[PDB]
């Protein structure tokens, strides 16, 4: 009865959550025209 | 080295009668497409082509 045996202590882990998400511009607005009227160009 | 040379094979199983230009590729990730886009301008003065396919 030997046995490969490893101590248990108290192992600092700094591993959390991984969890995603959609992703976004910031640096993504739009363009609004603000004076009506046609598109010349 | 240049942008952007686009063929193009129609629902016959042929390629269109020619190629056509490839004008850019906008970035954004599109929601749901979650897929790029490729505006590519090709001549159709052969009145062959229609708006959308």
Redesign the interface.
């Known amino acids: 009865p030997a046995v490969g045996v490893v101590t248990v202590k108290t192992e600092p882990l700094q591993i959390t959550t991984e969890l995603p998400g ?2 976004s ?1 910031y640096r ?1 607005a739009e363009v609004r025209p603000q004076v009506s009227g046609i598109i010349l160009k | 080295n240049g942008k952007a040379k686009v063929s193009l094979i129609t629902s016959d199983g042929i390629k269109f009668p020619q190629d056509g230009t490839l004008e850019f590729s906008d970035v954004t990730v599109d929601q749901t497409t979650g897929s790029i886009t490729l505006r590519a301008i090709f001549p159709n003065p052969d009145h062959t082509m229609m708006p959308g396919m």
Do not use: E, Y
């Open positions: 959609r992703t511009a993504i």
